[PDB]
Design a protein around this ligand. Structure first.
Ligand SMILES: [Fe+3]
Ligand SMILES: [Fe+3]
Ligand SMILES: [Fe+3]
Lengths: 503, 68, 339, 167, 339, 75, 64
């Protein structure tokens, strides 16, 4: 009888039990499809690798945060005591954390866009879970950066950073944005990156980046599944055979254009201790592991290695040394303190990049001689650059600086004029992007925003001066002696040109 | 009980162990200290699983070395 | 709070220049064309609950673990034995399940919101608002699967609830409201304002609070209140943040207040009608319910409706200067009472 | 030479003539000319490159307030500020775009539609779904055989004046 | 948890020799004189929940914080408005507060247990069971204080509940039982067994689950179920431990099993008798609640009594071999039922 | 937190030994004596809870009972 | 009635008299770090000094 008999064994409801029916939560109506422009249709029956409902998500992540935040506090108090970290890595930390926050924030919106693109509840759920993860981690960065805004927009690296970490994630076909975010961004560069930084940072006494980065590493398998499900959900769409490999190749080129020189500059110039030279690393991550093995296993769904992979390899040998020239030549526009390679840095460089000494080694030596580090020298190495015909250009598409007279890399200048405006492009893949799609690529470079202004007023307007009011955040050295102030920059009498005036 | 379907032991010393398993789309690895789960990760391949676990272990071991 | 790389040509932005890369056609990464509302500072919004990941996830975890402990103890008690069997099989299993489809639709309206909105705190509130709604849906299904484990022959498949949500006139007006809020607009302020401040604060509050929670408390349903307690808590937490964004930050913007109220009032007009329809269709469900004097009949239903519209007037309508005649709205819905 | 980034004389004087717009029709024609003159790659002039984005905002704000001050709810919902039926605009520009015989014909239709009808001229919802449907077609055409044309010929196709080609 | 320094003359010890210090007259720090029961090993019991301090306070913390979030949202909802004012003012406020004394009394009975008992895990289980009971008492008062904040003129003072508990005949049987189990004995296995396994499992279960929880979901009460969910979850957790100690370890001790059953059956007879008496007094309360077919008529109470006694037979009686005629016990209690 | 810090603290003592050997022994004595005291304090505080008449004073002793329990579980 | 008894680059410590006992607290970088009690003011200072010695030993080791 109902009122008396029943099973009184203890029972709950486990999450995979509620996840079994999640797919059926969606229903058919004619307007039921993504609001964003796309060439593809993610298939309505695609599945999610993890059977996680909202309550289970909260339970698993509340648990991690429990001890992870505890460990993070302990790391911050221990670092608040001693000298701790080596100074050079101490600077690379501030840049790493500032860039990470940008990317984790924009990833929130890229993942939301992807959730909108899917029609299966399960694939929506997978994307949703990455939204929540990117949120958790931006909050970790708020906490971190709270101890350590218009001051980073001043520089020239921040702009390239903004393509591969921000605009590339959210502006385009959602599929192309997935390739920027998961299939290339995370699978090829950042997931390998965060485990490697764990060793490099730890070797410089930085406890905080390993802690934060390992916490991020806990989640990446879900992000790589999201990337995979993008490709899978569209592999039966005839649009895929037509388009997927162009979107992939273009997005692979966008990501490698910034990270190939950027990361190598980070590792080899932002650390004293060097685990192994970046060019061998690059060829292992990108060419062999990502391009060989992983993309190889995606051929199942009609994915082919980027046709531009071989150009990318050709550039990986010197690109980060070229970029380092530009960063050193422009230090007053940045937000961290640079260190010229010391005597063993040079030895290591020559050892691993035969030719480094005859080229970059001598330039930096001459800059040191001409007063690179001396705040009484009124010397700005960008001026020496112009004053010896070594102009700096900015790729209209990628935003990566290019110095054709000093570059040992594989990029070449193309200066075009369209409808009354001159544009500089620096490789064959960017130039096709801009020729095919001018209206996607109108980003002003700094030479245009700051034209014919003195260097010091640009810095000062940007707030790149310490609480002091006169001493620059940026510095050409890492010692606590002989610091540069606005006056010392102004002495140089540096005024931005238009590098395309001569054409 | 290792087979072609199983997980694979990629590190074993007095204090640390690390495993990795092929999940088609990715490879999942974990690191144990004194038998207890410490850290979880993923790589594109067996090969990069090993390199990844080696990075994280260099960090752990440096932490241990700094406790003496 | 201030992570989004917004330029000075978006209210609040501190960067300069055009975006690094835009959509084909020229749509910016983020831009003013995404909403009809305007403000001097898109970053002004602050969740009144201070909900960030660590507290938001912490709280939901507590409710997750307690829910399972409570279920293990509930099946042990046998308290499902006094549930009224008709309510359980004919009204709860079927029509409270169809409401999972309703909450699911409201969660998916947030997806384009989380892509398009123009500040980090609004993206954060939006996402937790949408995660709670899929929580609501999953929780209703969790209840049904639990009852299925205590009551042999109780079918916890979603087939019937989905057929009811897609074809049964009781929910036609609801399903219509949700389908327009989700897949029919893209103004992200309009999605949030129509979904939480108008539709959900009238129909949603009626269906969750006035019908299934209230009626479970007259039919000896000792199980469903444990679940509507969570939906109702999530509604109030979300109302807190919706209020700060649309009342304090936008309808009182020091320069665009009157502007924003115009659009808010227009919106409210449109979706108040859609809400009234959903209710009028929904109130036909009482034809299938055993009569109870202060609750399941016209006098009571009128009182319930008087609470929804009256509360809504004091909490939303009067704050933006929108005029509502509770009595008329109540009558408009009661025209559907069918008794 | 240049002025500060966020506050300068160009933006000031432009806000000056923007304050004085007093009707939806005056403001509409103001914003359409301004967009045409200063935005896109087909823009008439790069004179205001550094300032048009801020200035566009200020026009958008002025136009939108005028829209709430002088127009009815039905016009806010269903009509562009040109007087046209917003639905009819969407049908007409999608129809034009589906008929474009080439990606270069498509890109011009899409760029102009944004130039003329970007909010607050079209109602936001009508604008965003039209923009999206045009983007679809434009990507479907542009990403067909995307690497077939060699770079040299592509430059001609774009109509570019090659100022320089490093060797 | 073998840290209590027990010698080899208390069952399961490893230390040797007398206590370093004893009570005046010679009572040992711990001794078999503390209980009628015997066993080969006192450290045998294991709490089935393995709820040590960390997990026991974790879980209660989640409940504590959720409770305040639920309350702040419930006040915002205005859900108090559909409750039977009569149930609210004349049954809940008065008779539910009286129930707090019952819970408070049960808590106190654990004070001697905490001191006297012979194993450290039993000490832990007993103390947490104690804590939950006083929690129950404080939570009832918490709900009363909450209603006082919403319905004007509602008096949350304990005066009337206390008068009703000490003098109203509805609770006389109960207060006697609690007074006896707390202050009328000191066998610490008799306190635990009579307290949890017999009295609270029949009368407490009837009063908390069958009357206040069940009837709240008949009279429109959407607040009280939130609070009975906590005490019912807590009752089920404790029964897990109580059953393990008295049924696995004690009533089946390889050498003293039968010895312990004699006393266990002796105890049950006596305290079952007090329970029936307490239930017989209590059922008088039906004479002042409104009649609802199936819940408050004689057939509803009968069926409620059949659940309590039938459940109790299965869960406890049959497991020590105590014979109860469920129909006879029910008819005994109904003799106090007016209808 | 205290459990988190005890963990991180407890792995470091493990891979080698940073503690002077004499104090290493003293730890063993201190932790044995601690355990006994915290365990008996549970029952002592229950006896005091039995001694008080006032529910508040009862409550105060009860809090100490739970406190002594808490720390035995750290041991 | 709070009395500051320690203040340097990083640590702060206060005591307060609660009649029956003295409650002290320690702040590291403005973050409440540790609570305690002592019989008197004097024994508050000795207690605070003991803990601060431990916290600083930790700071010393986490650099050298
Ligand atoms: Fe991320
Ligand atoms: Fe990631
Ligand atoms: Fe103690």
């Amino acid at each position: 009888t109902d009122a008396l008999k029943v099973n009184r064994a203890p029972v709950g409801v486990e999450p995979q039990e509620v996840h079994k029916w999640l797919q059926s939560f969606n229903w058919d109506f004619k307007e039921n499809r993504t609001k964003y422009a796309t060439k593809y249709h993610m298939a309505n029956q695609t599945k999610e690798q993890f059977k996680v409902i909202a309550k289970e998500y909260a339970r698993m992540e509340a648990a991690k945060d429990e001890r992870q935040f505890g460990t993070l506090l302990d790391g911050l108090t221990r670092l608040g005591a001693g000298n701790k970290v080596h100074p050079r890595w101490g600077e690379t930390m501030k840049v790493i954390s500032n860039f990470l926050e940008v990317g984790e924030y924009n990833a929130i919106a890229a993942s939301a866009m992807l959730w909108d693109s899917a029609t299966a509840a399960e694939q929506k759920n997978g994307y949703l879970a990455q939204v929540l993860d990117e949120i958790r981690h931006t909050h970790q960065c708020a906490f971190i950066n709270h101890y350590y805004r218009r001051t980073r927009a001043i520089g020239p690296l921040w702009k390239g950073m903004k393509r591969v970490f921000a605009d590339g994630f959210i502006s385009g076909d959602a599929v192309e944005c997935s390739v920027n975010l998961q299939l290339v961004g995370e699978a090829c560069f950042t997931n390998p990156l965060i485990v490697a930084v764990t060793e490099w940072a730890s070797a410089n006494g930085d406890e905080i980046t390993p802690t934060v980065f390992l916490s991020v590493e806990t989640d990446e398998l879900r992000h790589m599944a999201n990337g995979y499900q993008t490709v899978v959900s569209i592999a039966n769409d005839p649009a895929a055979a037509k388009y997927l490999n162009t979107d992939l190749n273009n997005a692979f080129w966008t990501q490698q254009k910034y990270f190939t020189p950027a990361l190598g500059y980070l590792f080899e110039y932002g650390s004293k201790f060097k685990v192994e030279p970046w060019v061998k690393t690059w060829n292992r991550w990108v060419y062999e592991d990502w391009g060989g093995i992983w993309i190889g296993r995606l051929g199942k769904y009609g994915v082919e290695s980027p046709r531009s992979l071989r150009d990318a390899k050709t550039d990986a040998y010197w690109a980060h040394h070229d970029l380092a020239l530009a960063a050193y030549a422009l230090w007053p526009l940045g937000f961290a303190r640079l260190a010229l390679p010391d005597e063993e840095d040079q030895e290591w460089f020559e050892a691993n990049y035969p030719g480094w000494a005859d080229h970059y080694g001598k330039i930096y030596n001459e800059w040191k001689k001409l007063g690179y580090e001396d705040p009484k020298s009124g010397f700005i190495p960008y001026a020496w650059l112009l004053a010896n015909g070594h102009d700096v250009y900015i790729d209209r598409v990628s935003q990566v600086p290019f110095i054709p007279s000093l570059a040992k890399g594989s990029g070449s200048l193309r200066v075009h004029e369209f409808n009354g405006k001159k544009h500089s492009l620096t490789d064959d893949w960017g130039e096709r992007m801009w020729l095919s799609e001018p209206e996607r690529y109108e980003c002003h470079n700094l030479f245009e925003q700051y034209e014919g202004r003195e260097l010091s007023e640009v810095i000062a307007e940007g707030h790149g001066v310490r609480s002091d009011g006169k001493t620059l955040i940026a510095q050409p050295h890492v010692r606590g002696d002989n610091l540069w102030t606005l006056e010392d920059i102004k002495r140089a009498g540096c005024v931005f040109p238009n590098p395309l005036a001569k054409f | 009980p290792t087979t072609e379907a199983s997980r694979i032991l990629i590190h074993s010393d007095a204090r640390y162990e690390a495993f990795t398993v092929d999940l088609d789309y990715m490879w999942r690895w974990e690191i144990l200290r004194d038998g207890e789960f410490v850290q979880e990760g993923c790589s594109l391949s067996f090969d990069s699983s090993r390199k990844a676990v080696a990075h994280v272990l260099s960090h752990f071991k440096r932490q241990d070395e700094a406790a003496q | 709070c201030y992570a989004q790389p917004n330029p000075d040509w978006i209210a609040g932005g501190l960067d300069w220049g055009d975006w690094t890369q835009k959509f084909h056609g020229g749509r910016p990464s983020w831009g003013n064309e995404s909403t009809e509302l305007r403000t001097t500072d898109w970053y002004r919004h602050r969740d009144p609950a201070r909900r960030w990941h660590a507290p938001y996830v912490k709280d939901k975890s507590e409710e997750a673990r307690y829910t399972q402990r409570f279920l293990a103890a509930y099946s042990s008690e046998g308290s499902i034995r006094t549930i009224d069997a008709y309510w359980r099989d004919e009204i709860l299993n079927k029509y409270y399940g169809a409401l999972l489809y309703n909450e699911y639709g409201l969660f998916n309206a947030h997806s384009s919101v989380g892509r398009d909105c123009l500040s980090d705190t609004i993206r954060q509130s939006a996402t937790f608002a949408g995660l709670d709604k899929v929580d609501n849906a999953q929780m209703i299904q969790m209840e049904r699967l639990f009852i299925a484990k205590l009551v042999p022959g109780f079918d916890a498949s979603t087939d019937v609830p989905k057929k009811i949500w897609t074809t049964d006139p009781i929910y036609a007006g609801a399903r219509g409201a949700v389908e327009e809020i989700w897949q029919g607009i893209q103004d992200w302020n309009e999605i949030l304002w129509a979904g939480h401040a108008v539709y959900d604060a009238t129909f949603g509050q009626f269906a969750r609070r006035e019908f299934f929670q209230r009626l479970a408390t007259v039919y000896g349903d000792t199980l469903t209140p444990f679940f509507t307690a969570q939906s109702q808590t999530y509604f109030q937490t979300t109302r807190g943040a919706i209020e700060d964004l649309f009342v304090y930050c936008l309808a009182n913007d020091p320069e665009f207040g009157a502007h924003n109220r115009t659009f808010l009032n227009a919106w409210t007009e449109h979706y108040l009608a859609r809400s009234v329809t959903a209710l009028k269709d929904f109130v036909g469900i009482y034809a299938k319910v055993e009569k109870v004097a202060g609750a399941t009949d016209r006098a009571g239903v009128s009182e319930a409706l008087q609470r929804v519209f009256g509360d809504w007037k004091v909490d939303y309508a009067d704050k933006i200067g929108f005029n509502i005649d509770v009595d008329q709205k109540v009558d408009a819905v009661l025209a559907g009472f069918k008794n | 030479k240049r002025e500060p980034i966020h506050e300068n004389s160009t933006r000031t004087e432009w806000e000056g003539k923007i304050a004085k717009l007093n009707s939806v029709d005056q403001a509409t024609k103001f914003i359409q000319d301004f967009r045409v003159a200063y935005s896109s790659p087909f823009r008439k002039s790069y004179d205001l490159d550094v300032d048009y984005q801020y200035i566009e905002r200020k026009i958008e704000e002025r136009l939108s307030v005028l829209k709430t001050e002088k127009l009815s709810v039905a016009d806010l919902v269903t009509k562009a500020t040109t007087g046209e039926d917003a639905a009819a605009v969407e049908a007409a520009w999608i129809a034009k775009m589906k008929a474009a015989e080439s990606k270069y014909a498509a890109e011009r239709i899409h760029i102009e539609f944004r130039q003329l009808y970007k909010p607050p001229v079209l109602p936001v919802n009508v604008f965003l779904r039209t923009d999206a449907a045009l983007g679809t077609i434009l990507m479907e055409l542009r990403n067909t055989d995307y690497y077939a044309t060699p770079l040299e010929g592509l430059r001609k196709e774009r109509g570019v004046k090659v100022l320089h080609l490093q060797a």
